[PDB]
Design a protein around this ligand. Sequence first.
Ligand code: HEM
Ligand code: HEM
Ligand code: HEM
Ligand code: HEM
Ligand SMILES: c1ccc(-c2ccc(Cn3ccnc3)cc2)cc1
Ligand SMILES: c1ccc(-c2ccc(Cn3ccnc3)cc2)cc1
Ligand SMILES: c1ccc(-c2ccc(Cn3ccnc3)cc2)cc1
Ligand SMILES: c1ccc(-c2ccc(Cn3ccnc3)cc2)cc1
Lengths: 442, 440, 442, 454
Amino acid sequence: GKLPPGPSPLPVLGNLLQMDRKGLLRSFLRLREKYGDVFTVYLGSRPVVVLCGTDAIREALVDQAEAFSGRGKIAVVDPIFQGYGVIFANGERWRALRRFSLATMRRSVEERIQEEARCLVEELRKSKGALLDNTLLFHSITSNIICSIVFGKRFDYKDPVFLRLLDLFFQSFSLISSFSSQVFELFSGFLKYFPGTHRQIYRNLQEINTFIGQSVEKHRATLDPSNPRDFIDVYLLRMEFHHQNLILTVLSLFFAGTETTSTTLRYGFLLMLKYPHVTERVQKEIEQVIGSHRPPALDDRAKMPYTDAVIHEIQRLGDLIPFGVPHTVTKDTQFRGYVIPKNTEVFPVLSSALHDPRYFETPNTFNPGHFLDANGALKRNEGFMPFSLGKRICLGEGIARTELFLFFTTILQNFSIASPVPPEDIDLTPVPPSYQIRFLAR
Amino acid sequence: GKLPPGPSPLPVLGNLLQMDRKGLLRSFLRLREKYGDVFTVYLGSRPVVVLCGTDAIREALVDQAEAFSGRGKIAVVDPIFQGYGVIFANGERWRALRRFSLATMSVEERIQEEARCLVEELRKSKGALLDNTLLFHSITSNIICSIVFGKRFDYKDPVFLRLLDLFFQSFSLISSFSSQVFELFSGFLKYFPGTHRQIYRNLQEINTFIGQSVEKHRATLDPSNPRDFIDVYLLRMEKDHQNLILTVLSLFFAGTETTSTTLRYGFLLMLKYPHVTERVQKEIEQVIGSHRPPALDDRAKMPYTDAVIHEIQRLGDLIPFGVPHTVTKDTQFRGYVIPKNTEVFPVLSSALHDPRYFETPNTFNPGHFLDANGALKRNEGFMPFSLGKRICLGEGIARTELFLFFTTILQNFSIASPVPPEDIDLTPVPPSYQIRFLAR
Amino acid sequence: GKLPPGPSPLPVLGNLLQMDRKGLLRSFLRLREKYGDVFTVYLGSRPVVVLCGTDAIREALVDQAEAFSGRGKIAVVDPIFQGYGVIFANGERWRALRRFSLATMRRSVEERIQEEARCLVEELRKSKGALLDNTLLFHSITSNIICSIVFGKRFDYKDPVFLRLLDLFFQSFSLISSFSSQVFELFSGFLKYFPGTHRQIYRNLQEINTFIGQSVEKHRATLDPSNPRDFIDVYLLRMEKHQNLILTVLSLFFAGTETTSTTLRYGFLLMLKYPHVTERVQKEIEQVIGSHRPPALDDRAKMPYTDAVIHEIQRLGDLIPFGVPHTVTKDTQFRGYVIPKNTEVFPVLSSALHDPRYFETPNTFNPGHFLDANGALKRNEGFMPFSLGKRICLGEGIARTELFLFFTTILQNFSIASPVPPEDIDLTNVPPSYQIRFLARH
Amino acid sequence: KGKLPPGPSPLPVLGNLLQMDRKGLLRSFLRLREKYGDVFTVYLGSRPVVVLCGTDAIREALVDQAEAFSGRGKIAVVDPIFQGYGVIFANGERWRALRRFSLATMRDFGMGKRSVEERIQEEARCLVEELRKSKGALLDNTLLFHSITSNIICSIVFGKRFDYKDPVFLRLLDLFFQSFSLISSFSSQVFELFSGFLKYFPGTHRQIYRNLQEINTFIGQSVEKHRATLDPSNPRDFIDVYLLRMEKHHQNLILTVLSLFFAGTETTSTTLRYGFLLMLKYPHVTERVQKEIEQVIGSHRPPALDDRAKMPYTDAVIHEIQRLGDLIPFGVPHTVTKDTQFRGYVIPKNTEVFPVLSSALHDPRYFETPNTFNPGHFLDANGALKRNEGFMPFSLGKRICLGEGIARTELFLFFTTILQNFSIASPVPPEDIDLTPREGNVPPSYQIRFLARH
Ligand code: HEM
Ligand code: HEM
Ligand code: HEM
Ligand code: HEM
Ligand SMILES: c1ccc(-c2ccc(Cn3ccnc3)cc2)cc1
Ligand SMILES: c1ccc(-c2ccc(Cn3ccnc3)cc2)cc1
Ligand SMILES: c1ccc(-c2ccc(Cn3ccnc3)cc2)cc1
Ligand SMILES: c1ccc(-c2ccc(Cn3ccnc3)cc2)cc1
């Protein structure tokens, strides 16, 4: 019974000097070759266990789910200061949210998404096939879904309030560091920056908490059970400053997710620009199953292997969350013939699975074959886990994947796509590059 | 026996919603007004104790030094994984470095010689408008080089530049408000220091190099004449590799960088207030005259200039929050309780601007550090280097760099800029700017 | 969310000054009246949560079994010193023993108890109805069972080796303390005496181990699989797939048998006080088993009264009034209080066995407790002399079978008498030493 | 490099409990020392404990690193989650207070040291009067010694000694030394080890004690009486000292102190019992002592504390008695406070530690004949008292006996005064006195006769 093997560390720095010039990911890969699927690396004085390949990540997150579900120290409340019960309250809250998101699936996403998909088309027609940067377009459409689900009705793309919160929630801003400043941090035991809060993207923060209040007010007055129209009055029901903020927090979480959805699309479309023959096939399957006279609907995905396989492939290659979200072991645990002590930090390196050779004939090339059998139907591939697995698997998986199928097909149904750059010359290597694309009505 | 009071937190966010639009500092200040000199705020789910004003910070860092000296979780080794002894080795190593830095206090001469080189470079400027940023990084850095490798680099030496590049290479990481709220909810930050890549070529070239210098040193080294910090390394080694040095080197640079900025800020300040620069140039002529380089012993006979430099460090306030510490033992502080392992901010800024110690906390004012007769006077609020068990290891070097570099410059040149003094905006890190050095 | 209420403590002593003159149990009871079913008391500087009444104990040990299953600090290994894996090894070992004991129940255990039951009768016949102290007799019979189960064959009552180990395992010996010596201990944080501390603890044992070695040898020297004949070669098999483990296991088995023996001793005295009950039982015996065959386990089903009586005996006897203290594993929410991980907890078994909400007359001998109107056995939730939950007695099966068979077989072949008239028997947790006479019914 | 103290490998549940000498835990520690050295790690149950052997090792720990090795056992550590801090701290200050008060008894101006000396002197006197009234009868000094040492504590706490047969005295002599035993089988113990919980626990016994409720009452009476009559700045005894800290929980706090004090007195009493038996076996030593007594104190005044200075032999002898007696062989276990570096090993905060006092009192590097009675241990060539570092029957460091002062003064005075006025004899001939204890480190029971020297 030993700890997962790893490279020996240096004081202050840990293994920070043995990383590939190529990046932390390459490092983890070369490390795997030497030490295997489970190993121990050091960021500063702290050890972390790295999990590589499908099988290893699955065993951990799935087979021993309770053991591997813990959050990072920043998220753990100190009873000595807050006492328990806030611990537990949070507990019940989580379960509640977790429960509500299943209900959403069981005018649900399918219809709301079908609506938004329409609006998108109309906007794309009004583009009159102009070259543009889809970034704002995709953020808007994925976001609206969240809005319809939370406040009850989509915003108009140019609605002040919408923009103000599209602004708040995706406002970029960067913090700056020198190599020296960092080594020092490592030596302090404290990072320079911490979250909180927007500076000029905080301008609207004041307005958005405020907007929430208003919507809750309106909602409250017309509220009726057992007729909960959207998430707000669901809140109001569990209920029946702090409340407005509690909402925010959910809202924020939801947006953190939508942003990934949006990027998954952006990446997907660029990818399709590089590979028009695929886009063609998909347009074909579309015409063969949905035809030309009705909107695509969620039930169609079943009868459209290629397109699904293609979307799967997009999530796979895209790999937007390569490291997964780090967890924290809950109980001293026996894993793959090693030991992992309660409170060890752990990386399920999702990327190492999405590119796992034992599961993907060509881990680095775009290849729908990954998800198709001889007969050409969708086939399960265990390496496909872009949403993670286990107790903490994405709360948004359902909504997101439905967003991806519908937004994707509806678009390819009504338009074809082109760019200045010739397919041969599209560089897929990165977040996906900003680019220009043109939507042409069919 | 209670915990330090504070604003009630929200789930996930903590007190992150009750901060002033104006910034974390303003918040801490308004908070002080309401809860007092010691209070408790929440970043995420985690509590942190904030320390405000001279008296409070001093009590903590100085009076209860052992209690308030702990480092952040990132810096704490886990025995279950590494075992103890590496804990202890580090321990002894620290004491060693701590001991060596007192021995260093040489420095005086090396600085003086660098001071000279600076002057010659400033002459060659032929009074051209420039951005002193690179100049100051170079001069302060060389000191560290002379102290570690044994001899200054030439300002344009490839190796120098390559490491001036490694150690100050800026690079930024980017975050959305949403990405952040999510981090808070994960318990994990997106970015960890140094994980980033990486100037890999440069770090690698140096690592290779230190090797070289150690080699050379090894072959020619001897006692009781250990020339520079490398041998001292070689000696502690021979008494019982390239990587430890690097780490020290980095630490040293992290510091030098602050020294450089303290100068940059100082000079801009003097551009806004030429009548002060005049006085200083006067005291310089009255005490050091015009025919010898300023020397450390001069500071004693030059109150004004000292007071001014003090005032510069005060206003500059480059480390407003101090470096967060970690309580070591359950402790009784100012009639509250602080549990072992509580994170703590000694908000240095709150002292450097403490009204109980500075007649005009927010205006440049050398009177802060002068009595009626006009001699240097101790001001307890002056704590830019922190205080206590972990007070700056570089305090000595740094302050010596500041006095010499400052005076020598003002001795041989006067300064001017496009922007008229009335129009210099001191509000921020100090703005990038242009300045001209004119020989006297 | 608060901690369980309780009396305020004093420095060093805790609540040790507020105990009834009557004993710790009375205290817990008076405490219950004031603070309720869950409260917090202090032994020295250390808090402990006390659990009172059936419902409370059950909720804890049963409903939240994983939460309330932790052992005392003495039993918790320090990884810094021993590393994990020994932690885990122990873990798997436990499960193993736990598994083997269910198998024992699945040549068999019942027969082994029946054969011993016979031997008991023959010894009781050879008593020629002499007044004696059944203490040694009962320790012997219950012990043999363990020996048949472990080494494969009963010892003869006067076999040297038997006696030598009957001696080791039940050898009494006492340690002595002054009130002052104790207050001081409380102030040191350390007790004067430690289990296993004694010189004799060691001496008895070395001799014990040697016999084991031999039996393992023999057993080792002759087994075939799955021709395994008892616990030894079961050991040998898990090994092939030492004496030290066997010994520990055996000691725990004896720790238990000792309770079984006392349960009998108490039972018989009780019956001396209440001959009209003994009569009934002798009657049911004749009505169901008759006079010409030994009682058998299957008979208990068709003998409500007798079962009810044995239940009543365990209930009143209350040999483990405080239960075996446990240690909360996870921060927990219990009965609208909070209990922090690592809190020590008493499930005061006695408070259930005497719970008014479940026993018409908690303090008088009353088989009615376990019978319905029609006179069949009825479940009573308060009956938990073996504890409940993840750590419920490993020996429950064997013990209860020992109790039914030993009891009935005896009362079938003999009747009982004493000098003292039932009116005078003293109930006065150990049962008084006494004299009893077994008279054949021929 | 940096490693934990070495030791024998443990077994599940049992730890090292199977590798102990048949001879007893002490012999074990000794044989273990031979193999692993002065600092090693043994396992009681699943718990590790660090064992400290020999003078040098114990001294380095308790003395050189005193703050590091001063921690109490888990039973004595308050949980903040339940009690909050401050009770932690209050206790702290309380301790210091008691610690301060005990020095005030010993030094050395005002009430100070002499008042205490006088009390022992008086209670010593009665011992003589009582011994005269024995008319040289064979008796068991156990109760006599418990009484005399106890009274000191009473004079110090309540302000005046108790008549030896005074009901209240007896009642509390009874409470505080009342023996009572709990019983265990080998199996019941193995099980405990497996539970993580011991069967018994201090005070958890109902019997302790009927008198407990009544004494407690006594204190109230005494505190009451004291309260009305007391006055600073002359504070007569510990009660009004309490009253003063109060005026600046009532009996409970006193009771606890009282108990602690008695726990100690009991050791003092045994030290005497042992001492006297020892002298019965070695009458030629008793003669010498009686001689020094006559040569320094003469025959016409009571011995006084200042005499010890001028009486090397007798002192050396008493030292030797404490040494051989070894009433607290294991010392009182402590608890490491801070992760520590000790003798080139590592000891983690919260490790339990035994400073095996016996291993020092019998340390060959300090005692020519560790196992024989030998005053030479504490004398130089010239025959004066010489310091012996191995002599630490009171422990050392931050937590060294609070009673060292009183106790040692009790031992010198009680001892000499007695040997001054009587000589001693027993049925058993010296050759035949067996000094080895009985199942316990406690001295074997015995009969002795005090004969006046008139
Ligand atoms: C479209 C592509 C998306 C991907 C690949 C993605 C991926 C993930 C991943 C990797 C996690 C980590 C689970 C873990 O911590 O183990 C996650 C969790 C989560 N996802 Fe998403 N996300 C996406 C979009 C969304 C969306 C649209 C939502 C909208 C609700 C969302 C909500 C969440 C939330 C709230 C969690 C938290 C996990 C937890 O319960 O602790 N994500 N998602
Ligand atoms: C220019 C003015 C400088 C200022 C105002 C400054 C300020 C500080 C402050 C406030 C700390 C707080 C330490 C703590 O309590 O955590 C610190 C630490 C430190 N400083 Fe500087 N510094 C300066 C220049 C330098 C230089 C040139 C060096 C060269 C080596 C240096 C080396 C260090 C080191 C090694 C520490 C480590 C603290 C520890 O041991 O925990 N500093 N400094
Ligand atoms: C009337 C007879 C017995 C009674 C009343 C009894 C009662 C108990 C009780 C109350 C416990 C504590 C469960 C807990 O930890 O909460 C226990 C545990 C145990 N008993 Fe018995 N016992 C009896 C006989 C036996 C016998 C014959 C064995 C033989 C194996 C035995 C073996 C054990 C063992 C090995 C445990 C360990 C508890 C655990 O694994 O958590 N007991 N028993
Ligand atoms: C006659 C021989 C005595 C011996 C050998 C003795 C020995 C000890 C020892 C070994 C300790 C443990 C200290 C430690 O943890 O290192 C101790 C503690 C103590 N003893 Fe004594 N004692 C004696 C008599 C007394 C007497 C008469 C008193 C009367 C007050 C006394 C009061 C105490 C007290 C109050 C402590 C508290 C220890 C602590 O503060 O942690 N002892 N004693
Ligand atoms: C550390 C912490 C968080 C993350 C992170 C990963 C994915 C996302 C986007 N997202 C949100 C919900 N599902 C996916 C945000 C943050 C990565 C490293
Ligand atoms: C959090 C992390 C690092 C720090 C820190 C502050 C100042 C400095 C500059 N410095 C380093 C040594 N002397 C000055 C580096 C890092 C503060 C908060
Ligand atoms: C604390 C420690 C041990 C015990 C204990 C409980 C039961 C027994 C007898 N026993 C053990 C297993 N089955 C019955 C011995 C000790 C109780 C409280
Ligand atoms: C473990 C726990 C307590 C003890 C103990 C030692 C000495 C005493 C008596 N005593 C009182 C003052 N000095 C010693 C009581 C208990 C020893 C080992």
